[PDB]
Design a protein around this ligand. Structure first.
Ligand SMILES: [Ca+2]
Ligand SMILES: [Ca+2]
Lengths: 119, 119
């Protein structure tokens, strides 16, 4: 669920609150449109697509589906106790939290003007 | 779908671009959490709750479900054709569309610092 995805970000980017990703670029944070401003934003577009697939599973609400994971000294792991939905969702979040850790944070891309830069 | 919800707004609040509401306060877009900054932000929060309830019917996906509405004179109307989901998602947009037309708009509350104002 949404809350768990915050802990994954906490697990791979311990120096950053999850609020720095809440509204960054044209994708990180709700909705999403236009061309990704950078690498970090591209991680979030991918994450959205991922969620969009995970929703094809019957009755699968990514944002609420509580899954089974483990964060060990930096290493994220989706255990096998998850159902097709939870299993998918967990993977969408894991690959996203690692993608953020890999990308560089452009402070000038935090809370940009959506209208001007994302149509 | 959101193309439709975007039309209900364009219909009840013709003096404003839909973008004016895509990034306003803590609930009208990004963030989705905290205390509504004003009468308008509260409209979106209620819209958000409304979508979660509607998300309960299997397959019902608010952002992607098309319904039957008619906008004439500033008076919206969901026709008695929509099915369970369609009928619910529609009523959600309709009530939000109206709300938006009756709630004051504060520029100061547009594109605010989510991290420092929605905790
Ligand atoms: Ca998004
Ligand atoms: Ca913003």
């Amino acid at each position: 669920n949404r809350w768990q995805f915050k802990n994954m970000i906490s697990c791979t980017v311990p120096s950053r609150s999850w609020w720095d990703f809440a509204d960054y670029g044209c994708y990180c944070g709700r909705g999403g449109s236009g061309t990704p401003v950078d690498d970090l934003d591209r991680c979030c577009q991918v994450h959205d697509n991922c969620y969009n697939e995970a929703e094809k599973i019957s009755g699968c609400n990514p944002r609420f589906r509580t899954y089974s994971y483990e964060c060990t000294a930096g290493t994220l792991t989706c255990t096998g106790r998850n159902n097709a939905c939870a299993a998918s969702v967990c993977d969408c979040d894991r690959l996203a939290a690692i993608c953020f850790a890999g990308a560089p944070y452009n402070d000038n891309n935090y809370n940009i003007d959506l209208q001007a830069r994302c149509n | 779908n959101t193309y439709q919800f975007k039309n209900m707004i364009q219909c009840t609040v013709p003096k404003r671009s839909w973008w004016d509401f895509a990034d306003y306060g803590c609930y009208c877009g990004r963030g989705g959490s905290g205390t509504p900054i004003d009468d308008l932000d509260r409209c979106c929060q209620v819209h958000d709750n409304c979508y979660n309830s509607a998300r309960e019917q299997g397959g019902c996906r608010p952002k992607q479900k098309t319904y039957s509405y008619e906008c004439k004179a500033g008076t919206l109307s969901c026709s008695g054709s929509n099915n369970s989901c369609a009928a619910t998602v529609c009523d959600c947009d309709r009530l939000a569309a109206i709300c938006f037309a009756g709630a004051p708009y504060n520029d100061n509350n547009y594109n605010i610092d989510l991290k420092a104002r929605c905790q």
